[PDB]
Amino acid sequence: HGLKGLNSKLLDIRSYLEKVATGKLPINHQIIYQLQDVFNLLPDVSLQEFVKAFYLKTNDQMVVVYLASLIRSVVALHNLINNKIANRDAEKKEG
Amino acid sequence: RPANHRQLTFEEIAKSAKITVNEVELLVMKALSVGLVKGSIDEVDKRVHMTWVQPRVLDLQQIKGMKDRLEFWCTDVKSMEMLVEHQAHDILT
Amino acid sequence: LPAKDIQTNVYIKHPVSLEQYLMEGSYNKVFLAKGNIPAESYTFFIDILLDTIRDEIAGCIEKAYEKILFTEATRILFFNTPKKMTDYAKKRGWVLGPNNYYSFASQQQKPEDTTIPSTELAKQVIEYARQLEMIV
Amino acid sequence: MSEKKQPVDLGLLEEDDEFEEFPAEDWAGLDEDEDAHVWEDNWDDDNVEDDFSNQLRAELEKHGYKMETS
Amino acid sequence: GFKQTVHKLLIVVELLLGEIPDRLQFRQPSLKRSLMPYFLLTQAVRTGNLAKFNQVLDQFGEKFQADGTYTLIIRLRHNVIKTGVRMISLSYSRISLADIAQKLQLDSPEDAEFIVAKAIRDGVIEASINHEKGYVQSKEMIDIYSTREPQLAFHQRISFCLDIHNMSVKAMRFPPKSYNKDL
Amino acid sequence: DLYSRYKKLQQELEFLEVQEEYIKDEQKNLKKEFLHAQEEVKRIQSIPLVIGQ
């Protein structure tokens, strides 16, 4: 995805910056104010208010941790039982 | 000031508009009444927080700064793409 | 060292009692016990030990988490000879107020921007897809 | 190795040879009131019990006199 | 029969931090008899009486002090006051000159703030040293990381727990290979 | 024969070592085919149908 946005943005802003200084025949410069405006609608938020949101998403991360560890620990039952009861019985009954 | 503590105070408004502190509330109330700004300030002590606004005329220092912050965003997205994709493509593909 | 050789001499139990007082850190008992040592000629070496631990005792008492007043340093610190306020002014390099010791750079560190730990969390997710799906 | 447990068990035999059934019966005087009881609660009940064994064991009968004096 | 040594030394080195967990979940008539002489003093650690328990130790002390060189118990004889002042750190903030100083068997202005400061320089507690009228205050904020930088708090908890549980996932992947290896 | 077993055995070291990435390819590809055929037989089951007894 980073290349999917990288080729688009990188492919566009080069000819854009070229037509900024080397441009004439009005290219509708009026929409450029909305362009840089929306680009400046995210002025590097300090993330102060979103800390608790990182606690919520990271708490859901903890939920996925407990689900993975616990559920995989349940999956280990049949493996860590059959590995013994099959090997020792097949070995003791092989000969 | 696009970034670096955009938050301000009424001292610059009253200083630039040579108006008293009693009329700045009607000034920002008229500013919100026109509809060119949507700024809502949750301040306790007098502060001036602003929101989306349109220059509508021209800004060359914001064209050069637009190239600076734009190239910075592009090279940061490229840096994260090469960083994550570098080992990510080698271990996951 | 407790080999039960003598165990009744004051010099046998002196290092363990002085080291246990060092674990307590009480310097008043050592200063009042300075004249308790017999004519044994290592009292000057004990003074050398006090000279090599005074930097740690004075350094720990001058930690200054929030603030400390000079009226306690008069009693806790050494005699009126201005060696500590002179050497420590060129060693610590702090500000000297109106007969008071000020403490700066205490819990003044600004928290992180949460950007770098998010990047290392992304790297941790990369390692989670790695270790969780490597053999596959 | 499981072979180093033998001298430790010999030390346990020496501890058992110090007093012959004296701590089993003397401590059984309290164990008969402690048997079948959850030993997790006996740590708190024994903590406050031994803590108040010296003085102010009950102290509830003294509050009626401490109301007017304090 | 063998875990009484790692458990005995375990609680002996655990009571140094002021919090001594006794035998709660294990019921066997070996650690009980092993702990019978040590029970009175390991219960006497928390109350922290210097003069009485000092005589109580050597009074009936035979084996735990006859174990050799009496190192950790000769450190405990002066660690009683440090665990007691750590209980004071678990107690209220303001320190009086008569009530709590007389309670701690230490009635003097200098050694009070001096030894309390020796407990502050350890770094295991949190206090605010302030002198306004002569009394020594403290903020004693022991509030847990709940709603106080949580991501940096349990970040290493998530990474470490996922590392241990993930190498446990390896420990449930490899033994099946050691199962299907022969067939 | 005694000393030749080392360098002769190295060929078995390479022949058995080359199977690692191979069984990696099979175990990573045949499960992708397992979900391909799994979703292919799953999408056969359609909602419009007749109800019998």
UniProtKB/Swiss-Prot annotation, chain A:
Coiled coil: none annotated. The chain holds residues 196 to 290 of 324 of the full protein. Component of the 26S proteasome, a multiprotein complex involved in the ATP-dependent degradation of ubiquitinated proteins. This complex plays a key role in the maintenance of protein homeostasis by removing misfolded or damaged proteins, which could impair cellular functions, and by removing proteins whose functions are no longer required. Therefore, the proteasome participates in numerous cellular processes, including cell cycle progression, apoptosis, or DNA damage repair. Component of the 19S proteasome regulatory particle complex. The 26S proteasome consists of a 20S core particle (CP) and two 19S regulatory subunits (RP). The regulatory particle is made of a lid composed of 9 subunits including PSMD7, a base containing 6 ATPases and few additional components. Within the complex, PSMD7 interacts with subunit PSMD4 through their respective MPN domain. Interacts with TRIM5. Does not bind a metal ion. It comes from Homo sapiens (Human). The modification N6-acetyllysine is found at residues 9, 19. This is 26S proteasome non-ATPase regulatory subunit 7. It comes from the Eukaryota. Belongs to the peptidase M67A family. Signal peptide: none annotated. The lineage of its organism: Eukaryota, Metazoa, Chordata, Craniata, Vertebrata. The gene is PSMD7.
Swiss-Prot record, chain B:
Keywords: Acetylation, Proteasome. One of its GO terms (molecular function) is structural molecule activity. The keyword Acetylation applies. It comes from the Eukaryota. The modification N6-acetyllysine is found at residue 15. The keyword Flavoprotein does not apply. GO terms for cellular component: cytosol; extracellular region; ficolin-1-rich granule lumen; membrane; nucleoplasm; nucleus; proteasome accessory complex; proteasome complex. GO terms for biological process: meiosis I; proteasome-mediated ubiquitin-dependent protein catabolic process; ubiquitin-dependent protein catabolic process. Component of the 19S proteasome regulatory particle complex. The 26S proteasome consists of a 20S core particle (CP) and two 19S regulatory subunits (RP). The regulatory particle is made of a lid composed of 9 subunits including PSMD13, a base containing 6 ATPases and few additional components. Belongs to the proteasome subunit S11 family. This is 26S proteasome non-ATPase regulatory subunit 13. The chain holds residues 284 to 376 of 376 of the full protein.
Curated annotation (Swiss-Prot), chain D:
One of its GO terms (cellular component) is proteasome regulatory particle, lid subcomplex. Its main location: nucleus. It comes from Homo sapiens. Keywords: Nucleus, Proteasome. This is 26S proteasome complex subunit SEM1. Belongs to the DSS1/SEM1 family. Component of the 19S proteasome regulatory particle complex. The 26S proteasome consists of a 20S core particle (CP) and two 19S regulatory subunits (RP). The regulatory particle is made of a lid composed of 9 subunits including SEM1, a base containing 6 ATPases and few additional components. Belongs to the TREX-2 complex (transcription and export complex 2), composed of at least ENY2, GANP, PCID2, SEM1, and either centrin CETN2 or CETN3. Component of the homologous recombination repair (HR) complex composed of ERCC5/XPG, BRCA2, PALB2, DSS1 and RAD51. Interacts with the C-terminal of BRCA2. InterPro entries: DSS1_SEM1. GO terms for biological process: double-strand break repair via homologous recombination; mRNA export from nucleus; proteasome assembly; proteasome-mediated ubiquitin-dependent protein catabolic process. PANTHER family: 26 PROTEASOME COMPLEX SUBUNIT DSS1, 26S PROTEASOME COMPLEX SUBUNIT SEM1. The keyword Nucleus applies. Expressed in limb bud, craniofacial primordia and skin. CDD domains: DSS1_Sem1. It is found in: Nucleus.
UniProtKB/Swiss-Prot annotation, chain E:
Residues 1-143 form the PCI domain. The modification Phosphoserine is found at residues 96, 108. It comes from the Eukaryota. Component of the 19S proteasome regulatory particle complex. The 26S proteasome consists of a 20S core particle (CP) and two 19S regulatory subunits (RP). The regulatory particle is made of a lid composed of 9 subunits including PSMD3, a base containing 6 ATPases and few additional components. Interacts with UBQLN1 (via ubiquitin-like domain). Interacts with ERCC6. Belongs to the proteasome subunit S3 family. Component of the 26S proteasome, a multiprotein complex involved in the ATP-dependent degradation of ubiquitinated proteins. This complex plays a key role in the maintenance of protein homeostasis by removing misfolded or damaged proteins, which could impair cellular functions, and by removing proteins whose functions are no longer required. Therefore, the proteasome participates in numerous cellular processes, including cell cycle progression, apoptosis, or DNA damage repair. This is 26S proteasome non-ATPase regulatory subunit 3. It comes from Homo sapiens (Human). The lineage of its organism: Eukaryota, Metazoa, Chordata, Craniata, Vertebrata. The gene is PSMD3. The chain holds residues 323 to 505 of 534 of the full protein.
